């Protein structure tokens, strides 16, 4: 057996992961470190079910997530190194011609927009793996 749904206080479980819905005005790199210093990382998203869960708890005024154009060539990848095997980009996003808009945020609808990394948003989402109880 082995059930993996234990999360630290203040975190919320969904499937095998734990999620922290942070509040407080931050630009992307600041949110990146807030997550890191809590033993998590800016969230990566891998299914409709996981997106649906995030949308349910998402801040209405937008949140930083863990997707960024790290290689500076137009390919948006997860900072946690996980596979890009799902997307919820808003229609037309990411824009082909938007130099500098390398960071990614999630709107209240849950759909993703690129953004200048120094934009200030009032929310940001972290994740980490849940720990497990022995059967």
């Amino acid at each position: 057996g082995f059930v993996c749904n234990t999360c630290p206080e203040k975190w919320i479980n969904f499937q095998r992961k734990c999620y922290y819905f942070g509040k407080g005005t931050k630009q992307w790199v600041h949110a990146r470190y807030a997550c890191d210093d809590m033993e998590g990382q800016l969230v990566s998203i891998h299914s409709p079910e996981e997106q649906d869960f995030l949308t349910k708890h998402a801040s209405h005024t937008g949140s930083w997530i863990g997707l960024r154009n790290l290689d500076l060539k137009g390919e948006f990848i997860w900072v946690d190194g996980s596979h890009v095997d799902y997307s919820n980009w808003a229609p037309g996003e990411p824009t082909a011609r938007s130099q500098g808009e390398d960071c990614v945020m999630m709107r209240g609808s849950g759909r993703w927009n690129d953004a200048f990394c120094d934009r200030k948003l009032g929310a940001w989402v972290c994740d980490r793996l849940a720990t497990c109880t022995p059967p």
Side-chain angles (χ1 to χ4, degrees), residues 63-79:
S63 305
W64 287 120
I65 65 179
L67 196 59
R68 178 166 182 161
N69 174 25
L70 292 172
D71 284 31
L72 307 180
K73 289 301 178 173
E75 209 210 359
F76 288 81
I77 64 180
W78 299 111
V79 300

Side-chain angles (χ1 to χ4, degrees), residues 118-135:
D118 67 328
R119 181 176 183 190
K120 292 171 178 293
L121 293 182
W124 30 277
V125 179
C126 309
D127 61 15
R128 54 192 283 164
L129 292 175
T131 54
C132 323
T133 51

Side-chain angles (χ1 to χ4, degrees), residues 41-46 66-68 70 76-85 127:
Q41 308 190 240
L42 284 169
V43 70
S44 68
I45 310 176
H46 302 286
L67 196 59
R68 178 166 182 161
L70 292 172
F76 288 81
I77 64 180
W78 299 111
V79 300
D80 67 14
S82 66
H83 297 325
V84 180
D85 49 13
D127 61 15

Side-chain angles (χ1 to χ4, degrees), residues 21-92:
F21 295 88
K23 307 290 180 181
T25 302
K26 295 182 193 318
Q27 60 181 239
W28 188 89
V29 75
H30 188 171
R32 163 153 93 93
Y33 281 103
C35 289
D36 286 342
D37 284 351
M38 286 193 287
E39 295 68 67
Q41 308 190 240
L42 284 169
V43 70
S44 68
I45 310 176
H46 302 286
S47 62
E49 290 80 31
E50 181 172 30
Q51 180 66 66
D52 285 343
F53 164 86
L54 295 175
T55 299
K56 265 70 166 183
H57 297 83
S59 166
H60 171 243
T61 55
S63 305
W64 287 120
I65 65 179
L67 196 59
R68 178 166 182 161
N69 174 25
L70 292 172
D71 284 31
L72 307 180
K73 289 301 178 173
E75 209 210 359
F76 288 81
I77 64 180
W78 299 111
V79 300
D80 67 14
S82 66
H83 297 325
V84 180
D85 49 13
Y86 167 79
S87 63
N88 197 34
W89 286 105

